[PDB]
């Protein structure tokens, strides 16, 4: 029954592809040709953060657009005050190898994780006066690549065991598991309504899950290599994926398509971090060429280059109010651009 | 122009920077290593020996100091077979200790392939490899005794002969050392096929219970630090 099952699975895949082609009436470039280009955007390094020891591997902006948490391979989780460059907290880590960090929307907790298989949630608003490990989650069998906060009690995490997990922090157990990916899940982005989230893995596929149901609704495959970053459009009906080849592709949820791709013949290295502006007109992508590129998310034209890092940009985030974009590379430095 | 709260916050930031610099001194002084190998190869034995003599957890860190210098050996466990993604975390380590079991010739070939993945990696182009040809008493016994001809797996063994090299000082059967060096020949050929900056392989013929492994690691790390000094200090 294996052969007939494979044949009918291929038939279903062909039907899905045919429906996708039949829904592709026009290209986003043709529709966007009528509107004016955004022009050159010359962002400058307003602030630099130079307190870390080793390569910075992740960062996350707060809801207040004031504090940002940064994770480095030395075992340090530093919370920076962007306006004044001061350091609020310097949390040591039990495991030095950290690949992701998340800042809770309420600001009370901060998440970290990496090769230690454990998502460590730290409490910053303790009445006891010090930052302590609020809880350690140890249900994964692979390196944690991205953890994101839904609320103060629920977290969503992606690991290298080709699975994602929704945890209840108080109980400490996996409330829900997502086991559709066939490769290492490296990125994770939550929708603004916190009901769906897209996970990008190394199988050149980005999968849209449902938090409250547990199954997978859409699977977008348009890349020919790994996927390292993924980020929702502010609308929530689209997202952008950065890949190990120099292509950033924008997918739409409603049509289940590949709206348009951003690639240049002069860029060869892969993309590490992808984020959008508040409007969604600008897409900032960090590269291994030691610099970041801003693309016009509707015209697929490179609107500018950050070009302020001496090593590969690993993390890149945009504040909720759209005030600034913070980029961190494998140098000890984290730079804020405006 | 700063207020009382702002000045106190700046003072707290300076205090944080003090501990950050204190930790930076140790981190720069500390020497970081990565231990890689298959389940067949003797890897838990080596870490157990160096811990005695000096769950689903992922990373295991082993402090061990020799000649008053510390080594932070990192073992990656509870991870999938595909290592091409988390290995990017180890561009700053001093060396990669690759342990290969020389007794089992059936799985030896794929081990070489794994070595290639470590050597021909776009991220470990500067990272040197300290290769450990482990489980040699088993090799010794395997080759001295009959019925496990090397030629059954590698056709080039018949056409290979021992060179004018350093035979071990104690008594060693010439065919045993011939096979023992032939195994090293493939690894060094892979190492020298594509060489980059500070990218050299240090092969050591070792045993799991041998107590000199820490000394070999210390010597190889001394050579690697020598090379990175010659590069960092303006000499090359």
């Amino acid at each position, epitope marked *: 029954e294996l052969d007939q099952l494979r044949q009918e699975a291929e038939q279903l895949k062909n039907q899905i592809r045919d429906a996708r082609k039949a829904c592709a009436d026009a290209t986003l470039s043709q529709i966007t040709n009528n509107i004016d280009p955004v022009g050159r955007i010359q962002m400058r390094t307003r602030r630099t953060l130079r307190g870390h020891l080793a390569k910075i591997y992740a960062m996350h902006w707060g809801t207040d657009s004031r504090l940002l948490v940064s994770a480095s391979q030395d075992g340090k989780l530093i919370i920076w005050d962007s306006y*004044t460059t*001061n350091k609020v907290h310097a949390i040591p880590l039990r495991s030095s190898w950290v690949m992701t960090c998340a800042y809770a929307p309420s600001g009370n907790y901060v998440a970290c994780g990496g090769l230690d298989n454990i998502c460590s949630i730290y409490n910053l608003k303790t*009445r006891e006066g010090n930052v302590r490990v609020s809880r350690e989650l140890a249900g994964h069998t692979g390196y944690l690549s991205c953890c994101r906060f839904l609320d103060d009690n629920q977290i969503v995490t992606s690991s290298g065991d080709t699975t994602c997990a929704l945890w209840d922090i108080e109980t400490g157990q996996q409330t829900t598991t997502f086991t559709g990916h066939t490769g290492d899940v490296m990125s994770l982005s939550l929708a603004p309504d916190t009901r769906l989230f897209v996970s990008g893995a190394c199988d050149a596929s980005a999968k849209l899950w449902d938090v409250r149901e547990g199954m997978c609704r859409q699977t977008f495959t348009g890349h020919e290599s790994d996927i390292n970053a993924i980020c929702f459009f502010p609308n929530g009906n689209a997202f952008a994926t950065g890949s190990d080849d120099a292509t950033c592709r924008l997918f739409d949820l409603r049509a289940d398509q590949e709206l348009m791709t951003y690639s240049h013949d002069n860029i060869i290295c892969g993309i590490t971090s992808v984020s959008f502006s508040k409007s969604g007109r600008l897409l900032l992508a960090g590269y291994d060429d030691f610099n970041c590129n801003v693309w016009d998310a509707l015209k697929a034209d490179r609107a500018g280059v950050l070009a302020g890092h001496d090593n590969r940009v690993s993390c890149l985030g945009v504040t909720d109010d759209g005030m600034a974009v913070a980029t961190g590379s494998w140098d000890s430095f984290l730079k804020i651009w405006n | 122009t700063l*207020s*009382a*709260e702002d000045k*106190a916050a700046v003072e707290r930031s*300076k205090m944080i920077e003090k501990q950050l610099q204190k930790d930076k001194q140790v981190y720069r002084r500390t020497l970081r290593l990565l231990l890689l190998g298959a389940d067949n190869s003797g890897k838990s034995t080596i870490v157990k020996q160096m811990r005695i003599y000096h769950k689903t957890s992922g990373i295991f860190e082993t402090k061990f100091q020799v000649d008053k210098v510390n080594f932070h050996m990192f073992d990656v466990g509870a991870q999938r077979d595909e290592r091409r993604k988390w290995i990017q975390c180890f561009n700053d380590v001093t060396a990669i200790i690759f342990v290969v079991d020389s007794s089992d010739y059936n799985r030896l070939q794929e081990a070489l392939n794994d070595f290639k993945s470590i050597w021909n990696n776009r991220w470990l182009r500067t990272i040197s490899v300290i290769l450990f040809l482990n489980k040699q008493d088993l090799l010794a016994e395997k080759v001295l005794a009959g019925k496990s001809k090397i030629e059954d797996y590698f056709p080039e063994f018949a056409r290979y002969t021992t060179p004018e090299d350093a035979t071990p000082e104690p008594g060693e059967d010439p065919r045993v050392t011939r096979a023992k060096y032939f195994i090293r020949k493939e690894f060094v050929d892979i190492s020298t096929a594509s060489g980059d900056g500070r990218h050299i392989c240090y092969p050591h013929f070792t045993c799991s219970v041998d107590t000199e492994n820490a000394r070999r690691i210390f010597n190889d790390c001394k050579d690697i630090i020598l090379q990175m000094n010659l590069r960092e200090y303006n000499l090359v």
Partner: single-chain antibody, 230 residues
Framework: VQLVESGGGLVQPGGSRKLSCSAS????????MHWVRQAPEKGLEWVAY????????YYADTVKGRFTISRDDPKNTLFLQMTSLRSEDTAMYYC??????????????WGQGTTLTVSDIVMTQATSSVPVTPGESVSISCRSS???????????LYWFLQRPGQSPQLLIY???NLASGVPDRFSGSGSGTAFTLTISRLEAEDVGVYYC?????????FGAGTKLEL
């Protein structure tokens, strides 16, 4: 968190003493500390402040020079050398805990305090006593001689409630932020040189004396203190 002071008693004038405050539970090394003295028939008054790391030691203008003060982080104990005792120092001395960062809440915990008996910016409260009935909202307002709106964007006034026979407890910090562990009914508002605190649906166990502070620049002068009774 516990923060208990000791070293009180009858003192002959012109003598010396050591007030020792012991901390238990919280990170003393990461927290700054303050001393506040309250006369039997008067309000609060700032005495001294020690920053984390002992890199910033500030004293009150009215008493500068005649106190020594230090901290012992390994012993988690803060020492205050009382020197040149005067009759104006006849007051209960309270220990205050404060950490300073973005979003922090300084002046959280106040110790029980020890009585000691021997043989600038000014803020004033319009009313020193308001007769109120439980269940009715009450407004306590105080004014300052200087505007507390710093250029950063937040006003540094703090509100404290002292119940009869109890240590003062923080209610509102920075004129708009509600302290931890206090009922949501309290609120604070106002603008330059005029701040007010509103207690909606007044309940039991909230009567006492209310003070409003300043933190733009040392010294941190207190208010007269509005007394609220049933």
């Amino acid at each position: 968190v516990q923060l208990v002071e000791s070293g009180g008693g009858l003192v002959q004038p012109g003598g010396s003493r050591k007030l020792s405050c012991s901390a238990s539970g919280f990170a003393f090394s990461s927290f700054g500390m303050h001393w506040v003295r309250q006369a039997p028939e008067k309000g609060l008054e700032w005495v001294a402040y020690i920053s984390s790391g002992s890199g910033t030691i500030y004293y009150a203008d009215t008493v500068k020079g005649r106190f020594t003060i230090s901290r012992d982080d390994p012993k988690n104990t803060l020492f205050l050398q009382m020197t040149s005792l005067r009759s104006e120092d006849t007051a209960m001395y309270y220990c205050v805990r404060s950490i300073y960062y973005y979003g922090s809440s300084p002046f959280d915990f106040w110790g029980q305090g020890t009585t000691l008996t021997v043989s600038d910016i000014v803020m004033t409260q319009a009313t020193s006593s308001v007769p109120v009935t439980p269940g009715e909202s009450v407004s306590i307002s105080c004014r300052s001689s200087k505007s507390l709106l710093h250029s950063n964007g937040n006003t540094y006034l703090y509100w404290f409630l002292q119940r009869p026979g109890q240590s003062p407890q923080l209610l509102i910090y920075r004129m708009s932020n509600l302290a931890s562990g206090v009922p949501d009914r309290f609120s604070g508002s106002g603008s330059g040189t005029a701040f007010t605190l509103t207690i909606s649906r007044l309940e039991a166990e909230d009567v006492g004396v209310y003070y409003c502070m300043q933190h733009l620049e040392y010294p941190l002068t207190f208010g007269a203190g509005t007394k609220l009774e049933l």
